[PDB]
Write a protein that binds this ligand. Structure first.
Ligand SMILES: *[C@@H]1O[C@H](CO)[C@@H](O[C@@H]2O[C@H](CO)[C@@H](O[C@@H]3O[C@H](CO)[C@@H](O)[C@H](O[C@H]4O[C@H](CO)[C@@H](O)[C@H](O)[C@@H]4O)[C@@H]3O)[C@H](O)[C@H]2NC(C)=O)[C@H](O)[C@H]1NC(C)=O
Ligand SMILES: *[C@@H]1O[C@H](CO)[C@@H](O[C@@H]2O[C@H](CO)[C@@H](O[C@@H]3O[C@H](CO)[C@@H](O)[C@H](O[C@H]4O[C@H](CO)[C@@H](O)[C@H](O)[C@@H]4O)[C@@H]3O)[C@H](O)[C@H]2NC(C)=O)[C@H](O)[C@H]1NC(C)=O
Ligand SMILES: *[C@@H]1O[C@H](CO)[C@@H](O[C@@H]2O[C@H](CO)[C@@H](O[C@@H]3O[C@H](CO)[C@@H](O)[C@H](O[C@H]4O[C@H](CO)[C@@H](O)[C@H](O)[C@@H]4O)[C@@H]3O)[C@H](O)[C@H]2NC(C)=O)[C@H](O)[C@H]1NC(C)=O
Ligand SMILES: *[C@@H]1O[C@H](CO)[C@@H](O[C@@H]2O[C@H](CO)[C@@H](O)[C@H](O)[C@H]2NC(C)=O)[C@H](O)[C@H]1NC(C)=O
Ligand SMILES: *[C@@H]1O[C@H](CO)[C@@H](O[C@@H]2O[C@H](CO)[C@@H](O)[C@H](O)[C@H]2NC(C)=O)[C@H](O)[C@H]1NC(C)=O
Ligand SMILES: *[C@@H]1O[C@H](CO)[C@@H](O[C@@H]2O[C@H](CO)[C@@H](O)[C@H](O)[C@H]2NC(C)=O)[C@H](O)[C@H]1NC(C)=O
Ligand SMILES: *[C@@H]1O[C@H](CO)[C@@H](O)[C@H](O)[C@H]1NC(C)=O
Ligand SMILES: *[C@@H]1O[C@H](CO)[C@@H](O)[C@H](O)[C@H]1NC(C)=O
Ligand SMILES: *[C@@H]1O[C@H](CO)[C@@H](O)[C@H](O)[C@H]1NC(C)=O
Lengths: 442, 442, 442
């Protein structure tokens, strides 16, 4: 990793990250076979088996009041919530195909002689179909034989404990779908075991290196996917799991951090703040800007981003890290007439905007307070310090390793006359700030 | 459903939705009876029963370090987080009444001879009271008799397994309240079973059709409610569940989507974006605008909205979908001098803002890439395509069925001279953009 | 608590709150000993013990595809998400030290003869180390002896049920880390029991009163901390729990609420809205402003705030509650030319902005609709009413007790000529609104 402190704008850019981009969704349809449990009855009073049977029938009946479909410029603000909404739209759209009675029987037909099969739906979409039959097999082969004419308080406690082991997964699947109205927020271990997740990732329509990274880091696949209830069909619970396809890996990414750049003359301030902070990743000849926090996530040098969360930006947008004052690109900034003191942590350090009214210092976990910082924008290396403080507020630096570089330059905010600085601006092109000053003076 | 593409503003409006509005809260107070478990002791070493007894006493003691109260213009930004905060304020306010010692004894008195009773609190609020006594009954009638003088390693394993079945609900109730500091985020199956949820909804102060919809879709009632711990009173755990009352159903709702409308002349751009996107629902003679995402949620043609999340808007606000340029209503927009290419998915299609610098196409799940899109704002029907792409970013269209209509009109952005277009604006009335151009030229 | 209604700005300030500020993180490292389970085999077919053994080995193997690090001006917008990101950076930074093989052996060495030990890491940071050995002890001392040559279908069901009791905690630890990709969102009862949480809080580097408050309210410590997986080392699962250190308590805090202040003349409106809403707390000679919702949380008179979420503001910023029009502090506001009717709930009442187009009233839970409100900004006491409504939207008031006071003053919005009121402003200093009017007229 290589981090550049951009002195002219009180910002950093950290390069050397490797992309892991979610480019598609792989659909794994499940049929969890429960078995013939309605036709089982316990009439000999309270029992361990009766308790497990009553839980199982109550969970199966509860599943029918759950339904996932039919009833039973500020760049960051433009992209906010898009990927999350896009994920639900995609999942609900294919669930509409799967929910058809004919599509379900076709799924069950593909699973008659095996526990896994690749299937194509009526809309031409290819999915993986998986059967889960232990509970049905236990009910048919073992439990029903032991309840000869409705006597469940049998001396075999192994049978009662076996029942509670075999129905645990089905009960959790019902809990997770009933609590979330049919759309789970993630892929639990009851929707998809480790073996099933490894089997589904291996079947994804992408290349070997992508599948190897997803297999070796499948807890992240778990975290980025979700499950949708399709419905109950006979004694089978049918749901689908949307698995993220990380189809592009190891392309260049970089992150931009920024803090308020304030310059003062005669007690008055001119301040600006870069509004292009966040992650950038390249793919197939274009650069995508991911302006919102929840949309990208690092694991070491790799950054996991949802492509549906980004905005395609021009290549020239990188000149905001180069010649922000003179560039022809409309570099986005906000402005203020009064300073904000704060800390913007970087991958390899911290940006410290320390202005009049606060005290700032850097600290060591072994040695304590190292030094007080001077007023202005300061760049602290995580080799220089372990913590940075604004007054008493502690900011713990990362310990990520990499080379830091200072790209010298007079802060653009220093060129402003505070007496002529415009009204506070929010997410405006920087040349519109200059245009405001130049027009108001003419 | 009927979707109109508004060519003059690069936006859509989809009508035909049916409201499900949360209008009130129904309070269900629970007394979970644990029984006399403190006066039980296991002195014969490690045991299955001892393990279950130690879990139960540890969970009961842990519940006393949990407390829910006392210690032991940009329309979207104005409404953000209001409903969530309002829900907690309402729940904490009535929990203040219920937490009184006199109010608790009155609740316990109403439940002496039955497991459910309608009760009125000292503040005149009517609640449902529910008793849960299995664990107390098992402890009193069964477990205590088997521990004759502190010997728990008894040959009866049925007793140990029965204990672990009977205490499971109480342990989960303690887990859910301890992890969330007394205020659960939703209504779990341990706070309220399917039968208890069906009983509470049936007792709600609303009409039959509302109760029928809530009963048949009670997983959504689960998802929109939450639970508050009241405290431990003797051997009884007392909590309350706030259940959403969907008191208004099947009134007209509609959703507005929008994408940047950009017009270019001689390499310069004038762009605007509608800032009135989101859900609108009518009720009792007024129109409520729900500007934030998490506040409404669809299930087919029905949309579930929290009324505390909306802003009452004038009826005339709908003319932004009709005569946005000439209307007297202050239609909210943002502006830019440079284009943003993006996709805004609609219920029945997609708005594609495709401008210089990116490539856009529409695809089919059977046939592949259908066609490249021309530069400008395009409306794609979900009958025309299955996916829309900006460069490599895929947006999956919905498969919702309904009639699409194009309402022709010259884009308002085409009327602007880019050389005279104002500084970037955020959530301003559209006539203030024209006023800025007209004033700056005078 | 003492609440002041500020008539000149349609806002309230509520004083008398006591701070509970998260000032640091205490790290509790765990080694959960699983035991020699790989070298156990069941070859006699299906068994209860085999099922528990297969779950345990599958959970142990699944834990190796989980990794938390390396792969296997608008004040509110500036501070949004800072504390959450800072918490993860701090936790990942110390996990980098703990993940070293030498650091792990040192932790295991400190725990050889005891279940708890204070240890200092190579980076000079002091942590608490905790061992959890029941599952290993059960596997070594009890389970392995019962499987004499791979026969697990033994007549001892006590052994099978004991196994399922002893492995429950380890299975849940694996579930919570696998679902969240190694970084749990909170501290569950399986990461840290009540006794371990009480032991860790008692060891925190803070004063007695802070530890007593944290001990007596440790469910909030649970809610504000989280856990990070370090890895699997032999048969030991190693994770760390970041516990919030509430190192400052009972210093003054106050909250500011606001609603649109609109004045109309001849059918035209001039409106402003205070944009300094939120929590303020004092500490060590400075005032910190917490502009975002999720960053502070009340429990009675105490408010729990994360210090990493705030912005250090000048003491003079409080004059926005005193002389907002004449003060030299740049009091932040937004503006509009058209009114927004809404309700801003206060700790001891409600601000009601009731303008043309809507109807507003206050209600009682015993008596019903009390009275219709007049147009303008109204302050309702929670002693006056139980609910406030805008049209049909109900806002339930709190029942918090305290003294209310009206600080009389002509609304600043009344001083504006609507015909000369500027374009809509977002988060601008109030004197810049006056400057816009005065400059545009010159
Ligand atoms: C802000 O900074 C960016 C990045 O530094 C800068 O963009 C760069 O501009 C230079 C201007 O020369 C580009 O270099 C040119 O590239 C073209 C081909 O595309 C060449 O034909 C040019 O060659 C001429 O000049 C050479 C000497 O400089 C001669 O050797 C040659 O014979 C030609 O006369 C020249 O190399 C460069 O490609 C871009 N870089 C990128 C990545 O865009 C931008 O101009 C700056 N903006 C400002 C300050 O206005
Ligand atoms: C933007 O579009 C909206 C919606 O299209 C539009 O609002 C509409 O304005 C028309 C103007 O006529 C309204 O229709 C009038 O309604 C009143 C009663 O409220 C009638 O008295 C009027 O009748 C007169 O004109 C009729 C012929 O048009 C004659 O037959 C009659 O004898 C009268 O002379 C007339 O019907 C209409 O009600 C509204 N619609 C709504 C829902 O508000 C608005 O004016 C447009 N704004 C612009 C472009 O400035
Ligand atoms: C907006 O309101 C705030 C708060 O009310 C206000 O700040 C206050 O200003 C007064 C102005 O007098 C300050 O009081 C002064 O404090 C200094 C010491 O710091 C004293 O030297 C001054 O004493 C002189 O005046 C006294 C009589 O008023 C005489 O008795 C004495 O002999 C001196 O002549 C005086 O007490 C006060 O400290 C501040 N308060 C705070 C907390 O800042 C602000 O000025 C207002 N802004 C406006 C309306 O412009
Ligand atoms: C359910 O019943 C089947 C059939 O009796 C059991 O499977 C048999 O197990 C014995 C060993 O006890 C083997 O010798 C047989 O070959 C098995 N037969 C078949 C068809 O698999 C099974 O163990 C029972 N399940 C439980 C949990 O007890
Ligand atoms: C707890 O003890 C009660 C009382 O002995 C049990 O209830 C009895 O069950 C028998 C059948 O075994 C019936 O014939 C009696 O009529 C029941 N009596 C009453 C008063 O209900 C109960 O089954 C025991 N519970 C458990 C879980 O074993
Ligand atoms: C695991 O085995 C140990 C050793 O046999 C058991 O501990 C003994 O328990 C008996 C009572 O049954 C005591 O009299 C002994 O003093 C204990 N010995 C030791 C060394 O602790 C232990 O109970 C077994 N665990 C389980 C769950 O059965
Ligand atoms: C219960 O028995 C009836 C009659 O034999 C049968 O038609 C029905 O399918 C059975 N139920 C299940 C779930 O198999
Ligand atoms: C335990 O026994 C004492 C004395 O008999 C009694 O007062 C107390 O209420 C009992 N505890 C419970 C929880 O019933
Ligand atoms: C299993 O047995 C081998 C050989 O005795 C030993 O080296 C290994 O450490 C054992 N596994 C565990 C987890 O102890």
């Amino acid at each position: 990793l290589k981090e550049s402190y951009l002195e002219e704008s009180c910002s950093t850019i950290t390069e050397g990250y490797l992309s892991v981009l979610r480019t598609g969704w792989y659909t794994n349809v499940f049929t969890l076979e429960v078995g013939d449990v309605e036709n089982l009855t316990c009439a000999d009073g309270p029992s361990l088996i009766k308790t497990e049977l009553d839980l199982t029938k109550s969970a199966l009946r509860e599943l029918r009041t759950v339904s996932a479909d039919q009833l039973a410029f500020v760049l960051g603000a433009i992209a906010l919530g898009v990927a999350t909404a896009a994920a639900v739209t995609a999942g609900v759209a294919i669930a509409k195909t799967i929910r058809l009675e004919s599509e379900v029987t076709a799924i069950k037909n593909a699973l008659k002689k095996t526990n896994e099969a690749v299937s194509t739906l009526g809309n031409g979409v290819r999915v993986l179909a998986t059967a889960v039959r232990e509970l049905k097999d236990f009910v048919s082969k073992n439990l029903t034989r032991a309840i000869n004419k409705n006597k469940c308080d049998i001396p075999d406690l192994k049978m009662a404990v076996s029942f509670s082991q075999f129905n645990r997964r089905f009960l959790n699947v019902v809990r997770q779908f009933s609590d979330n109205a049919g759309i789970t927020p993630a892929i639990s271990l009851d929707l998809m075991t480790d073996a099933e997740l490894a089997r589904a990732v291996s079947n994804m329509p992408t290349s070997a290196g992508q599948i190897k990274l997803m297999l070796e880091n499948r807890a992240m696949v778990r975290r980025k996917g979700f499950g949708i209830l399709i419905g109950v069909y006979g004694s089978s619970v049918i749901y689908m799991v949307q698995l993220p396809i990380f189809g592009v890996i190891d392309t260049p990414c970089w992150i931009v951090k920024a803090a308020p750049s304030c310059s003062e003359k005669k007690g008055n301030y001119a301040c600006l703040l870069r509004e292009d902070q966040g992650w950038y990743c390249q793919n197939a000849g274009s650069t995508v800007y991911y302006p919102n926090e929840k949309d990208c996530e690092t694991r070491g040098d790799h950054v996991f981003c949802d492509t549906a969360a980004g905005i395609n930006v021009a290549e020239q947008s990188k000149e905001c890290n180069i010649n922000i004052s003179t560039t022809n690109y409309p570099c986005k900034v906000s402005t203020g007439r009064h300073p904000i003191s704060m800390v913007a942590l970087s991958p390899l350090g911290a940006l410290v905007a320390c202005y009049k009214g606060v005290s700032c210092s850097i600290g060591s976990n072994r040695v304590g307070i190292i030094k007080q910082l001077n007023k202005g924008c300061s760049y602290i290396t995580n080799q220089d310090a372990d913590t940075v403080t604004i007054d008493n507020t502690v900011y713990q630096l990362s310990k990520v390793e990499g080379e830091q570089h200072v790209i010298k330059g007079r802060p653009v905010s220093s060129s402003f006359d505070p007496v002529k600085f415009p009204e506070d601006q929010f997410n405006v092109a920087l040349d519109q700030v200059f245009e405001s000053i130049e027009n108001s003076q003419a």
